Write an enzyme that holds these catalytic residues in place. Structure first.
Site, PDB file in Angstrom:
ATOM      1  N   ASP A 150       0.692  -1.373  -0.161  1.00 28.28           N
ATOM      2  CA  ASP A 150       0.133   0.076   0.156  1.00 28.28           C
ATOM      3  C   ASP A 150       0.858   1.332   0.005  1.00 28.28           C
ATOM      4  O   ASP A 150       0.442   2.307  -0.463  1.00 28.28           O
ATOM      5  CB  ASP A 150      -1.076   0.138   1.192  1.00 28.28           C
ATOM      6  CG  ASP A 150      -1.921  -1.248   1.064  1.00 28.28           C
ATOM      7  OD1 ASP A 150      -2.489  -1.706   0.121  1.00 28.28           O
ATOM      8  OD2 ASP A 150      -2.128  -1.878   2.325  1.00 28.28           O
ATOM      9  N   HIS A 177      -4.863  -3.631   5.852  1.00 26.79           N
ATOM     10  CA  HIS A 177      -4.374  -4.039   4.489  1.00 26.79           C
ATOM     11  C   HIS A 177      -5.256  -4.296   3.551  1.00 26.79           C
ATOM     12  O   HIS A 177      -5.123  -4.708   2.559  1.00 26.79           O
ATOM     13  CB  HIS A 177      -3.392  -5.114   4.776  1.00 26.79           C
ATOM     14  CG  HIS A 177      -2.283  -5.262   3.291  1.00 26.79           C
ATOM     15  ND1 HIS A 177      -2.035  -4.185   2.692  1.00 26.79           N
ATOM     16  CD2 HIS A 177      -2.017  -6.390   2.778  1.00 26.79           C
ATOM     17  CE1 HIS A 177      -1.468  -4.855   1.590  1.00 26.79           C
ATOM     18  NE2 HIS A 177      -1.493  -6.016   1.470  1.00 26.79           N
TER      19      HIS A 177
END
Ligand SMILES: NC(=O)c1ccc[n+]([C@@H]2O[C@H](COP(=O)([O-])OP(=O)(O)OC[C@H]3O[C@@H](n4cnc5c(N)ncnc54)[C@H](O)[C@@H]3O)[C@@H](O)[C@H]2O)c1
Lengths: 312, 312
Positions: A150, A177
């Protein structure tokens, strides 16, 4: 120092083992493991690359042979989403293997830092914690959910949008996540100022990066290479800190002060024993503040689901 | 600079695109192409790595959009070999793919440097040439058969054996890219000395390194990661040379002077126009002299095959 990769035969595992073979420090050791019978040959193929990194591969139900003296254990075993599914579906699929794999670790290399890649991270980390706790060797500063992808995605999108050199942008990313739990702290990107809509549009894009890859591969897997590179950035960071390098900071999903949830991804200072200090998430913007709150219930649910699976 | 990878969705193709995305010079463009529908998805996955290399993927029958403006074209397309098969056995399944790809290169980017990875390279390079000659655009300084993988395997085995640091050894390798046409000049390795025996074992090992991997993967595939690494090095060398860098030397299979065969692999100085100068193979030992001789038959035989395939 020895690094062990569990799930080295899949798409993510191979890209990761390639990067580590070519980038770990001279003298490091890398052992690969997977149930897939091809596994040992994946090591023979990598063994042919001219770097001072000793590599070996193991197949079987027993991972034990490649965990001996391991300092870092990266887990990428499992399976991934095809078009349609989310990240909270293949649960029983992977949760099982994470459960199994974490157990062999506890018996064989309890004191090593364990990095979890297998999705959904939010849940699979909790499951690993419970297994480590249950076996009585849990060290909360040594269990991380690799959320690095990310970060590198946000780096890339911010760069392109604002016209910055991509290697010069680092955006902090907190929370979880998956989807809503992923929060880019864009208010904290030095030298760049965004408009509410950019923040909105960018955050959306960042949260849906994985889907972007699935729809493009048209049901031919999900992100594997960039995931590989990211897991690679994280493993090296972990390895650098373990060797004494100072100043190593990475955001990662860990067991914290429970201020927002039992597990939360925040900026971490890493050291010779894993997490050295859990940095603060800093000052948020109204939008981040807003977004931080609305995902909470979702995050602890994932954590919940994770705890359940083991204790019952 | 623009690099086009044809056959980008396979194992070599993907490992190769991963390395090139993180390693080509900032400013470069990377184009991916394969008939597999997943290809554009592979580029999107890689587009998430924050480096200043623009990447796009193309699928379908026509490589045209991938080839427009390419300066370098790497061809890793085609089928790898199964346990039991040999590099020679892939001629039938790969001749047509090579033929088709190279024709599109000819219509779209005739000036580009072409690296043929597709086996059997000894034969597929000959096919490419004839195809280019017929399109009336053949430049023998611009067509190369990637044999870099024999180099890196050589530097690895030599280092493990002599206890040298892998990154400090560079053994040169000439001939062709197959079981008996691969000749490593172990005598020219500055610094080390080998015994009659050592040369014997090392030589065989280097020549069957490919089979070592196929066998080890037990049907799973052949060398793909070590191969992606080798093709990346070669591609980086080419690009640095096209940019003006001096002293760039790589062994490759190309149409030489003919002293041993239409095509032969030897040390080449690379420059802004492709092959700048083909260096002398130098001083051969008794043994290397025997090898060089023993193999010429096969080689001309291997080249003969690629030619009549296009001509006849
Ligand atoms: N030069 C070397 O040292 C060396 C080492 C190993 C393998 N190879 C050769 O390289 C080739 C690649 O093998 P691999 O391991 O990637 O195999 P692979 O089967 O894993 O992948 C091959 C790819 O080629 C693609 N392809 C086939 N025909 C195509 C066409 N017309 N247009 C575009 N794409 C096409 C396929 O869709 C596939 O993704 C084989 O010929 C293999 O023998 C070369």
């Amino acid at each position: 120092m020895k690094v062990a990769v569990l799930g080295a035969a899949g798409g993510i595992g191979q890209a990761l083992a390639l990067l580590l073979k070519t980038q770990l420090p001279s003298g490091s050791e890398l052992s690969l493991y997977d149930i897939a019978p091809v596994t040992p040959g994946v090591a023979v193929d990598l063994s042919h690359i001219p770097t001072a990194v000793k590599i070996k591969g193991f197949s079987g139900e027993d991972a034990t042979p490649a965990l001996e003296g391991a300092d870092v254990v990266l887990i990428s075993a499992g399976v991934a989403r095809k078009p349609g599914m989310d990240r909270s579906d293949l649960f029983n699929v992977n949760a099982g293997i994470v459960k199994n794999l974490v157990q062999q670790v506890a018996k064989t290399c309890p004191k090593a830092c364990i990095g979890i890649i297998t999705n959904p991270v939010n849940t699979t980390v909790a499951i690993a914690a419970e297994v480590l706790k249950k076996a009585g060797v849990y060290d909360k500063n040594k269990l991380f959910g690799v959320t690095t992808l990310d970060i590198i995605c946000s780096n890339t999108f911010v760069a392109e949008l604002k016209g910055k050199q991509p290697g010069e942008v680092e955006v902090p990313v907190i929370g979880g996540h998956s989807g809503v739990t992923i929060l880019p702290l864009l208010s904290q990107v030095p030298g760049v100022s965004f408009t509410e809509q950019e923040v909105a549009d960018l955050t959306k894009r960042i949260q849906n990066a994985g889907t972007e890859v699935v729809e493009a591969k048209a049901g031919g897997g999900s992100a594997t290479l960039s995931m590989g590179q990211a897991a690679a950035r994280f493993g090296l960071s972990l390895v650098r800190a373990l060797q004494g390098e100072q100043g190593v900071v990475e955001c990662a999903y860990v067991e914290g002060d429970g201020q927002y949830a039992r597990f939360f991804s925040q900026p971490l200072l890493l050291g010779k024993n894993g997490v050295e200090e859990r940095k603060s998430i800093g000052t948020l913007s109204a939008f981040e503040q807003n977004a931080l709150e609305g995902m909470l219930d979702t995050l602890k649910k994932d954590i919940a689901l994770g705890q359940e699976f083991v204790n019952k």
